[PDB]
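User: Last request for today: this protein with NA7, please.
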Amino acid sequence: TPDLDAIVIGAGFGGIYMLHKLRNDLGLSVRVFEKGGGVGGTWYWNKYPGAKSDTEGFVYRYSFDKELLREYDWTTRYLDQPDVLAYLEHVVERYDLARDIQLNTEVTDAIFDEETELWRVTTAGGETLTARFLVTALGLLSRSNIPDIPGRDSFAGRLVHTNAWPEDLDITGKRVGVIGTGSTGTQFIVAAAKMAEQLTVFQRTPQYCVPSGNGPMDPDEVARIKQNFDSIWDQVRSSTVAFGFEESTVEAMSVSESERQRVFQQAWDKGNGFRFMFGTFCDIATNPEANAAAAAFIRSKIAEIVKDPETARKLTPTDLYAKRPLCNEGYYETYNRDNVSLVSLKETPIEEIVPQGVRTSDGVVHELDVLVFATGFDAVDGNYRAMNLRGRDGRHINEHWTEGPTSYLGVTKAGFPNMFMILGPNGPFTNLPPSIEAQVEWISDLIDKATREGLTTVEPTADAEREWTETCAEIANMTLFPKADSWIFGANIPGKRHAVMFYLGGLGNYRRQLADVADGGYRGFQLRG
Ligand SMILES: Cc1cc2nc3c(=O)[nH]c(=O)nc-3n(C[C@H](O)[C@H](O)[C@H](O)COP(=O)(O)OP(=O)(O)OC[C@H]3O[C@@H](n4cnc5c(N)ncnc54)[C@H](O)[C@@H]3O)c2cc1C
Ligand SMILES: Nc1ncnc2c1ncn2[C@@H]1O[C@H](COP(=O)(O)OP(=O)(O)OC[C@H]2OC[C@H](O)[C@@H]2O)[C@@H](O)[C@H]1OP(=O)(O)O
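Assistant: Here's the final one, the structure of the complex with NA7:
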């Protein structure tokens, strides 16, 4: 007999909903462990100025509770961090979840016992307990990556990663530097430039940013959207990227040059990064000719916006438009401010961090009070590999992942019976809340089957998992995404394996795969009583 039916790790969107399903809906005994001092995941940790959703707020929320969709108000087109956090706190209150979420608790070990067919979890505080089922909602974008830049530990001021931003830090009137220009670093830059006495941006790789279109919502428009949420969510769950817009079915090069310009400009004016990539034409990320056209449009905007042509040049990417789409309010415009400087680390790399700042290879010591690492995450697999997570035969998860992280269907793992993953390796690449929902709901159904039928283990086969790897690789190779150097394929961290880590088929196809597996008697699973 285990201590609990189930243990959930993580109290982000994922673990919150998992706890609700397993405790409230199924009536199991459940505990969540979260290493943070508060619930919210991303939206707890990322307290930096400018932190916000790039999913439009209307669909950056749960959908499973229709009354909550009716009731809950948003007032800005995108949601700032404190607003997403307050939403998640409200959900935890609504479903009486806080009583079974244990904060400040890092799980350091999770070990399957093949004799009792139970999981044993160990906390950093030195406690252990057992459960029948283990759900890891560890986050795809949660394990901070802080590069080992020479001299980093000598810096005498406030040195922080964005995912560890301290609530008390006020950068107003300070000399601030930021390393990194992905989604985090760019939205930070926009906010920080308005506060800092001087902002220095250390940019290794410029990205193709488009407008977000953010601003206030008309409350009459929020009421209309609420009235139409059924249809809105149907469209979301059937789409590829789940961002709440209709995805184009038109090949970019099938129209005239003027029509292509007009479509790109309409999207630019409407805002949203995924809208630019997938709402314009159907083949931006698959057809190099189409991709070139999209990239050219954005470069031409950069050239129009940025007044200093050297600064414009340094901001202008020349690689494939196939990193995760970025958007912001007034990003390129920020570089027209007198108090913002841009350092191209291609041209003048960092030589050394020093007590007073950062020294680049031109010998210039950039003096800083605050140095901000917007350097991203050990994405997807980082918190799995960090854990002492062992399955059958006492084998660590790392022994299974020597050519990249793997799963069956994004949510289970061969050799790890009764372990379910929320946004594990090789799952969907979308607006994440509705993918989380698909996964939580699927996992809930399988766990309930186990309960009703008296199953002691559920596990995927090694063949099924290999087949899923091949499926993901095949889909990924039909796209330009593998040729974009970013965190999505592991390439961002030195020594990390370059490998497919997402199913790139989209949410609608992903939901069908899950459904087809379940309706076919859990094709690929060994179910034992
Ligand atoms: C700044 C930022 C903005 C983003 N904006 C968007 C957006 O607009 N749209 C979108 O679709 N996605 C966005 N994302 C991705 C975002 O993480 C997801 O949308 C969603 O918040 C993921 O929820 P989750 O529960 O899967 O993971 P997370 O919110 O990452 O939560 C996982 C939690 O697990 C905890 N944890 C991990 N390991 C352990 C352990 N061993 N023991 C105990 N606790 C542990 C972590 O502390 C963390 O709190 C963004 C990410 C960032 C960083
Ligand atoms: N050693 C070193 N030196 C200099 N610069 C470095 C270094 N390591 C990383 N970086 C840069 O930091 C940035 C990290 O971006 P990203 O991984 O997208 O992380 P984000 O947090 O912005 O976004 C991740 C996701 O969170 C939410 C949403 O899905 C986002 O995509 C990027 O500009 C990197 O440049 P590089 O040269 O490109 O590697």
